[model samples]
Each structure stands twice: as C-alpha cells, then as structure tokens.
Target: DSDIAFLIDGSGSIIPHDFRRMKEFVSTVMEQLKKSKTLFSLMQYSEEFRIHFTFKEFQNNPNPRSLVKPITQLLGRTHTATGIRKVVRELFNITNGARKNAFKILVVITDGEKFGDPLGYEDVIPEADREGVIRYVIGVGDAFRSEKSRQELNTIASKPPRDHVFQVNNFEALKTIQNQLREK
Candidate 1:
C-alpha cells in the first residue's frame, strides 16, 4: 500500500474554468487508483495552502467529488516552494496521519511558474528525500514550457526526469498523461 498526497495549484494563473478542469483531472486520478488499496490526501495552494483532506479523513470517506467544492473556492499566487515546504513539514508528518510503513508519494501539479522564494526548496527537497518520499512534478499550460519553469520543475521532481516529470499543454490535455501518471 502507498500513501499519496496531491499538491494542487490553485493559483490565479489558472482561470476559473480551467480550475474546474483541474479538479476534474484530480477526480479522474482518484478513480484510476483503488481507494481500498491506497491512502489519499489532498492539499491545494496558491499564495496560501489549505488541506482539503488528510489520509485518515480520506480513509473515512474516500469520495473524490467531495473535494470539488473546497478546491473551487481557492485562488491565489503560485507560491510553489512554500506549498512544498508545508507538505514536507506538516502534512507528511505522523501527527498529520502520514502512514509510517506505507510508501510515501507526493504529486505536485502546477500551471504556472513559481513566484515565491526559489531558494526555499534547497532544504526541504533533501528532507523529503531523506524521509523516503518520492516526488512527481507535473507542469501544465504554456507557462510550464518556459526555461525557468522547466528548471524549477526539474529541481523539485525526484531524480530521473523521465520517470518523475510530466508536462501537458493545457488542462484539457491532462487526460493524455493520466495513464502515464498511473503507471509511475
């Protein structure tokens, strides 16, 4: 079994309609994974971060649709590093219900370039690695194609870009990568 957390970008860069599509993409991912076998958690962020559900709570009620309302209400800046830090420092902690024996995986989905302190990831990335966390970074939309964005994503993902990094042209194209993501 594995414990997976989805770090979703609810930044202003994603238009309201596209945000809806993002939620749909998340729901689709949940559908692909067997709820009985994997524990799930979801965190949404822009300038601020919010935990929509923790692994234990999802264990109580594994419905992915319930996440739509809260996620749709979030909107802010793309503070990517800050969000990652929070996940590593708090959300993945034992007190936050992270399973100690389960394989830990963090899936970061973003549509724009990061706007917060780029150097903040220096410590947290290593911390995540030491804690046996496997990270997958997904970039969506045009902004993700920029050199800076590509580098940022590469830095955040676990080693071997081909195995941990994924990019899509837009939210509508997310389905194209669904199978690949599940295989990872």
Candidate 2:
C-alpha cells in the first residue's frame, strides 16, 4: 500500500483534447494501482497549482474516473517546481491520508521544463527526499527527447534517471507506457 501523488502539467500549450487524454492516462494508472491498495492524489499545474483530489477523497470515492473526470486544465505557464513543492508540503501528509508506514510515491507528468516559477528544483527536491518521497517522471512530447529537456526531468526524479524517467513522443503514445509505470 502507498500514497501516490500525481503532479501533472496543465499549461496552455496543450489543447483541451490532449488535456483530457492525459487525464485518461492518469485515471488508468490509478485504476491499476488501486488494486494494490494504493491511495491517489492529484494536482495539475500551470503558473499555479490545482489540487483536484486528495488521498482521502480517493479512499472515500474509490472511483478513478469519477475523481479524474472533472479536472479541467489549469492553463497558463509551467511552474513545475512550484507544483512539486506543494505536493510534498501539503498533499503528502497525515491530514491528507498519508500513511506513516506506507510507501510515498510521486509521479510527475509534464511536457517539459519550468516557466515563471520562483522555486528552483534544489529548493524542494531535497525536502521531498527528506520526506521519503520516491519520484518518477513521465515526460510527453518530442521536446523530452532533447538532452536539455531530459536533464530537467532528471533533476526532478529519484537517482538513476533511466530507472525513473519515461519519455514518449506524443500524448497519443502515452498508452505504451501505462503498464510500465504501473509495474513500478
């Protein structure tokens, strides 16, 4: 059993159709993990963060799509670090259904990079580690294939990037790694 927080990018760069697809992907992942007794929480970020649901909400409803369907994109700029920091500080806590004995997993879904964020990776990554949060990054779009974008994903993931990063060429191809992610 674990407390899993999904930090997804909701920047304007992605249109509504693609945003819904990403939500479908997250709901599917949650469906798989819930079978293993996982509790899920979600936040979609742009220039700010939207806490769509908490671990307790998932526990109460226990319906992935029901919890995920209403999450409209929070479009603006990409402040990835700002969102990640919020997940660590607010979502992953006892008040939000975090279990002290359960594993803490963080899944970051984004196209790439941080924009208009005052918080740097160093500012909160270390704090996430201190809180025992294991991180995995699912980077969509061809942009992630570049070294520059991949490096940004690396800085946000747990050690040994290869083991923690999943890169897909497009949102339509997100299905290819659904099982791979749930396997983790």
Candidate 3:
C-alpha cells in the first residue's frame, strides 16, 4: 500500500505554462499508479501551501485530469523550505487520508532554491526523517545546474541521494521520469 503526497512549486518564477506541465505530471502519475494500488494527494506552494486534493478527495472524485486541472498557481515567492515544512508537518495525517499501514511518500517538484523562507531545512528535516516520509525531488529548469541546488535536493530526500533526486533540463522533460518512477 502507498500514500503519496505531491509537493508542487506554485512559485511565480515557474510561469503558468510550466506550472501546468507540473500539474500534468502529477495527473499522469495518478493515471499510471491507478486507484487499484496507490492513493494520491497533491499540494502546491510558494509563499503559502494549498492542498489541491487529499487522498480521500481523490477517492471521492477519482478523475485525475479534471481534479488536477483546477489547481491555480500561487505565483508568489519561492518559500521552498517552509513549503516542505508544511508538507512534513501537515500533509500526511489521518484527516488528510494518510494510511498508517501504507508507505508514506512526498514527491516534491520545485524549480529552484529557497528564498525568504524563515524556517531553514534544518528546522524541519529532522521531523521528516522521524516521520519516515520518503521524499523524492524533481528539480526542474537550469537553476539546479549549480551544486548549491543539489544540496537542496539531497538534504530533502529520505536517504541514498541517487535514489531520490531527479534532474531535468526543463518542464517538458518531466515525462521521461514518469515510467522511471512507476517502475520503482
């Protein structure tokens, strides 16, 4: 069993078209995973976090495309660390349709580094490790070409950095990892 939560970048820099691509990636993953096996939940964040749908919500609606298409981009600052804290602290829970017996996962799709996040990664990543929420990061765009951004990716992942970080040249490249993820 699996409980997967998506943490998407609704940041201003991502642009609407790329943001739509990010959403499409999520919808496609839901389609690939299918309901008979795992449940999916999604949350987008910039200055703040918004849960587009919980696992329970997906169970109720069960239509990935329609449910995912309505998620409006926040288009604000990239408060990535804070956004991650929100997902770690609140996303996976009984009320959010998190299952006790299922594998708790968080898939983060972000374009770049943190800017203006009051809480640093150190403030919350311990709790993430403690909670056993497996994390995978897909770093989009060229911002991650620098090693600084790779630290951001590795620090957030559960363990074994190679297993969790996905690098892409641009939004269009997200498709390459879909089956890569599903086959895992």
Candidate 4:
C-alpha cells in the first residue's frame, strides 16, 4: 500500500483560474493512479492550512469530483514553510490515518519562494527524512525563475534533484508533466 499526501500552495499569488487548474491537475493524478492501491490526502495552504481531504476520507468516497468544491473555496500569503510544517506534523502521522508500513510520499506544489520563516523547513524536512517519506517538489510559474525558488525546491525535494524536483512555466504547463508524475 502507498500513502501519498499532496501539499499544495493555495496562496493569493495563485489567481483563482490557475488554482482551479491546479485542482484539475490533481484530479488527473488521482485518475491515473490506482485508487485501491494508493491512499491520498490533500492539504492546501496560504498563510493558513486547510485539510481539503484526508486519506481516510478519500478511502471512503474515492471520488475526485468531491475534492473540487473545497479546493475552489481556498485562497491567501505564500507561507510555504508553515504549510510544509503542518503536513509533517499532522497529515503524515498515523493518528491522521497514515499507515506505518505503507510507503510514505509527499508531493509539494508551490508557486513562490518562502515568504514565511525558512527556518521551520530546516527542522521539519529532516523529520520527514527520518520518517522515511519521499518528497517531490514542483515549482510553478514566473516565481520559479528566481534562483532562491530553485534552491528552495531543491532543498525540500528528496535526493537526486533531477528525479525529485520539477518546474512548469505556468499552470497550463502542468499537463505536460502528468505522465512524469504518474510514472514516479
């Protein structure tokens, strides 16, 4: 079994239309994977973190359409570190329905560099490593052009930068990587 958590940036920086595109990208991923073999959770964040759905909830319904409504409602600062910390603290824990024996995977999608305390990530990322969680970091849009954003994504991603880090020029570019994500 596999436990996958998609930690997405729902910041104000991402316009409503693009945010909807993100949702569509996520829906595509869910459709590509085997629902029965993989349990998934989604956490969207700006300055605040919202649990759009948990693994247990998806296991119960397993409907991609159900996720769209809540995602459409999310919007806010690019507090990237806060979002990562929350996922590390809550979503991946067994108490939140993560399986101890299942392969733990975290996919982080962000549009900008951290506007919050970067220090928080220094603490939580190692914890993720200790927990044996594999992380894939994707940077989207013009913000990703910055050297800082590139470095940040590399730091957050699991070893082997080429294999774990991705970049798309814009939300529309997301469709180009659907197969790459599915293969990983």
Candidate 5:
C-alpha cells in the first residue's frame, strides 16, 4: 500500500490562524484520499519533528468533521532535522522496512526555514531520496519565500521547477488549493 505523510510545522512562528488552516488542509487531504488507495500519517516540525500519527490504512468516511477536531489537538515546537530523523527511524526504518513497491510520500508544510540542526536540508533530503521517498514541500507565509527558505525546501522536493514544491502567499490560499486538489 502507498503511504502519505503530512509533515506539519508547529514552530512558534506559525500563527494561530495558519495552524487552523493547516488543520483544514489535513481534513481535506483525508477526504480526497478516500477516493484512492492510500494510507495516511501525520508529522509535525518546529523545534522537533513529531509523528502525530503513524501510518494507518485509510478507509474513507463521509464524515471528515470529527477527524478535523482530533487533528487540531496536535501541537509542538519546531526542530526540523531531529523531528524528521525521528520519523525516518520510527516510521520508515523500524516500521515500513525495505519494500520494493512501497510508495513513500512526504508532504511538509512550514512557514520558516529550519533552525538548530547541523544536518540541514542539504544533507537530509538526499538521504530521504536515497531511501526511495518522494517529498512534496508546501511553504506558506512570507518567511518561506525568502531565498534561504526556498533553497532549503528545494533540496528536499522532487526536481524541476514545479514538480513537488508549492508556495502559497497566505493562509486563505491553502483552502482554495485543498479544494482544487479534492476536485481532481
């Protein structure tokens, strides 16, 4: 089965409004996944990367409202590198293992660049790619568009101008994007 991981950034910098928007995105993504054969997981990054939930087989339900409430309960500080490493060790390494057909998907949402880690995206992303995971990075808010932030995310995303990276200017835009994704 394919695995989809939502890597959220709960760092101090993420405003309350954006965090709410993030929850909505999660709900929408969950709703869309019901249309396909996919499993879902949740990850949060700020001072630490946390797996809000482990990979689970996805079964679509007509109701997404309850899911959104639980999703809002997750909170954390940002520690991008460590958090991601934890995810690799716990979720992919210890759990998923070496499966040739496994489609590992990582969706990271963040407002600012990573901080306090020697193993920056420059080093971390290549390792993730080598492990056979396809990463999609979505940056929201002005901080993420900064040159440094873009470079960091670029390292992790699939190559090409727009293959796997999305930059949104505001929180409201995320809802529109989610709606479009659901319709497809």
Candidate 6:
C-alpha cells in the first residue's frame, strides 16, 4: 500500500480565494482516495506545521466531505521551516517502523516563493532525498513559473525517478493537473 501526505501552505499570502480552491482540490482528491485503500495524511504549514489528520485515521474513511471541512478551516501563521521539519521527522518515524515494501510519498503544495527561512534549503532537501522518500512539489501561482522559482523547484525534483515539480497557473490549471495525476 501507499502512504500519502499533503503539506499545504496556509500562509497569509494564500488569500481566501486560493484557500477555497485548495480545499476544493483537496476534497476531490480525498473523495477519490476514499474508494481505494491508499493511506493519506494532511499537514498544514504556515508559521508552524500541524498534522490536522493522520494516515491511520484517514485510511479508515477517505470521504472528501469529512476531509474538506477542516482543511478549508485551517489558518496559517509564520514559520514554515520549523513545521515542515517536524512533518518530515514524523514521516521518518513512520517509515522507519514500517516494512520495506511500503512506499512513502510526501506532496508539498505551496507557492514556493514565500517562506520564513532561506538558508536551510540545500541541507533540508538533500536530507529528504537521502531518506529514499519521494518528494513531489506543486507550486501554485505565477511565482513558481518565474525563472528563479523554477530553478529552485528543479533542484527539489532532482532526486526523483521523474521530474515531480509542478506549477499550477490558476484554478482551471489545478483541475487539469489533477486529471493528469489521476491518469498517471
């Protein structure tokens, strides 16, 4: 079976409209996941990273309606690095105890342009890759399409079997992206 975790950014920059869109995308995905046996978790990151839900419970019922309410209600703070690190550590704990046959996937959904700390990217990303984890990143908004942001995302994608960095230009783009992932 597969374990999936969504690391979503709820920073002040996200705005209300994007938050709703994010929740919609999350709800749709969770609803579909409910039909399968896949285990998933939800992590919200802003000033801190909080695991609003864990895979053990989520796997019991993947219903979107049950998942969407809390996701949409999440509030963001300021320090992303600290929260994200905690999430990663928790994943490490989970994966370390599991059988080797299991697959662990961490999907980071953020604008990728705004954040609290900048100095630790190199070390943090490399450490994540070394753990044999799949790190898929989705950057929403034009900021991710910029030359600089693309470069950073490319670095994040370097450790994967395939390029996993994605940029969603808008709400319509998100639906298309979802379909693409579903087809994959």
**Lowest summed lDDT window (length 10), candidate 2:** 168-177
Give one digit per residue, the lDDT tens place, for model 6 in 1-184.
Answer: 5666677778877777766666666666565655364667777878656676777656555665686576643555534445446556774455433224556667766666545654446657666666655766666655465786565555555355135766543435445434544533
- Regions of candidate 2 where Cα sits further than 4 Å from its true position: 168-184
What is candidate 6's CA lDDT for residue 156?
A: 53
Q: Give the worst 10-residue stretch by lDDT in candidate 5.
A: 56-65
Per-candidate TM equals 0.84, 0.88, 0.87, 0.85, 0.75, 0.75
For residues 50-146, what per-residue lDDT tens digits would candidate 2 score against the true structure?
A: 8889998888998898998888887899988888889998889889887888878898988776788998898989989988888988877644767
lDDT of each: 0.74, 0.80, 0.78, 0.74, 0.62, 0.61
How would you encode candidate 3's per-residue C-alpha lDDT over 70-125 as one tens digit per residue?
88999888888887778866778789777787777788888767777888889888
Note the residue pairs that clash in candidate 4.
12-76
> How far out, in Å, is residue 127 in model 3?
0.5
lDDT of 1 by residue, 37-111 (tens): 787888998887889888888878888887555665467678888788888777777776787787788888886
* Clashes, model 3: 0
Task: Give the winner by TM-score: 1 or 3.
Answer: 3
Q: Which runs of model 3 end up more than 4 angstroms from their true locations?
A: 168-184
Query: Model 4 — TM-score against the truth?
Result: 0.85
Distance from true location, Cα of 180 in model 2, Å: 8.5
- lDDT by residue for model 4 (70-134), tens: 66535667777777778877888787778878877788887656775555578778778887778
Model 6 RMSD to the real structure? Answer: 3.9
Clash count in backbone of candidate 5: 8
Which run of 10 residues does model 4 get worst, by summed lDDT? 168-177
Least well predicted 10-residue stretch by lDDT in candidate 6: 91-100
Which is the winner by TM-score between candidate 3 and candidate 6? Answer: 3
TM-score of candidate 2 on Cα atoms, chains taken together: 0.88
Name the regions of candidate 6 deviating beyond 4 angstroms. Answer: 33-35, 72-80, 95-100, 158-162, 169-184
Leading candidate by lDDT: 2
